[model samples]
Target: MKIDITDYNHADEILNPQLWKEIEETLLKMPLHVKASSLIFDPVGTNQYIKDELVPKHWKNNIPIPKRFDFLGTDIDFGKRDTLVEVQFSNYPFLLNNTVRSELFHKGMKVAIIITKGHMFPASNSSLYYEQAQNQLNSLAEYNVFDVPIRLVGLIEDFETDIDIVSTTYADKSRTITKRDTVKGKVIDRGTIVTY
Candidate 1:
């Protein structure tokens, strides 16, 4: 999927800076557990933030999230600053349609955040993933499919044998998904990747 965290990370940060920073640190701190069906991602970072921010100001973990969103693996109403976040990592790399629509329809959610793999790999790896995210999202934003802002976390990972991580930066960009079935956003940053 288009996990270009650089752009989405920036956009994700716009709403909450400190929480986002803590989130970044949390991800970096996780031990490398590359296994199938393993819980590679955790919700504690954002989960606690949601608990701390959402109203009542005292909501704790494992609160009641809408049942329709079970696939997201987290709660949607599970937030305070009026933001909802979910992370996806897979070969199909596409976003979940129902989650966005339901959140917007139900809560008028401001941002439908997605943290996914930013189609980052070699040329031969082209068919293995979704390319530029802006392109994909724009194509999906059928002008009226759903009325909400989307900021995706598109991150590129380097598979160095040495897994010890260091200071980091993730890409999060804002791409315009017009009120039409087309991608008029930024040209896919090249090198970036392409195909045959």
Candidate 2:
């Protein structure tokens, strides 16, 4: 079955349940499968991050950067249309900058995927890393930076040190930042609005 959306289903990915459903299924099918220990132990970043050169923050104008992800694969060979998987397992800055760079510069980058842990229960940097991810998501969706289809997946670590997780993308469409019942919560809320 050949399905093309260049002329069909012109709905926003987040606003479309069908698209969200497809993405959720895809996220599950392609298990990134990381060991719980890899994040903190491995240096030059994590996983094959050193070899992958996913984050060469020291790159000068001519330092010749590496592939922008722990595993960045474009024109992917999945059973669906081609996709650009730009992922990271570390800080949100790398993911945000990389995602923005790709979005503003790379033309064919559809469905930019950014993966991160909601928070490390063991070492909660709290506002630093976890909230950073939340912070970016809240900002980007305003002007809809990377205005393409974006998928976010959270990696949950089990007590056994196994990185097993799941996606709730379909219904997780709206990253609603509803107001909190306390002081100093997520700065952005649904009723709030801003600009670039």
Candidate 3:
């Protein structure tokens, strides 16, 4: 599911209606479930200043004060009551910031950040960017957000990338997986959802 928006060669894939439809169909069948009441879709990344300033502020304080988010939804039913789902594009650093917000708002609510690696010409550069993003995410987890479980579900373009998924299990142990496809990246369509 990784896409290179900067490259015109892959623009059609990202913009194709049929391709989008297929992704949505697959997402619907995913085993993952979230209670509608707990879902929150924040499109704060759409704003450059907010993404740069407010997101980082919230991260440091674990609160979203001053209302910098462009989009925010509360009480979404994804089939899980205790979890809050946050979706982001490729802004991994910003995603890390919001993960802190999710941790503060609901205790024990699993914060899942979904990222799609973009297409790079050398391909090695893409992999390096993914690694750097992941390292920042891991550092955020070490901040001790109530020992609550957090998971990173990376939707990579292909198997060649080096991004790894890490999480805290119910048994109170940390687990890491290096394989890309080992974790399923469910694609949810924002158009179908009612937003606040």
Lowest-scoring 10 consecutive residues by lDDT in candidate 1? 179-188
Candidate 2: where are CA atoms >4 Å away?
A: 1-80, 103-106, 121-131, 143-146, 158-196
Worst 10 residues of 3 by lDDT: 70-79
Candidate 3 regions exceeding 4 Å error are 2-79, 90-96, 107-130, 142-146, 159-196
* lDDT at position 83, candidate 3: 31
- TM-scores for all candidates? 0.44, 0.39, 0.31
lDDT of 1 by residue, 1-196 (tens): 1124533323544556654544455445432222112112223222333344433443222333333332232323334355555543323334454354455546534554555443433222222233455566655564545445556554444442233211112121332212211111111232222111
lDDT of 2 at 78: 19
lDDT of each residue in 1-196, candidate 2, tens digit only: 0111211122244334543455444434332222122122111122233222322422111121334433222112111233333334433355456665565535433454444443432221221233456566657666555445545445332232222221111111322223212111111121111111
Error of 1 at 14 (Å): 4.7
Global lDDT for candidate 3? 0.30
Query: Residue by residue across 66-166, what tens digits does model 3's lDDT show?
Result: 22232221111121223333333323245445556645555433333233222221221112233444555566555743333333333333343332221
Ranking by TM-score: 1, 2, 3
User: Candidate 1: where is the Cα deviation over 4 Å?
Assistant: 1-3, 6-14, 36-78, 90-108, 118-134, 140-147, 164-196
lDDT of each: 0.38, 0.33, 0.30
Residue pairs in candidate 2 whose N, alpha carbon or C atoms collide under 3 angstroms: none
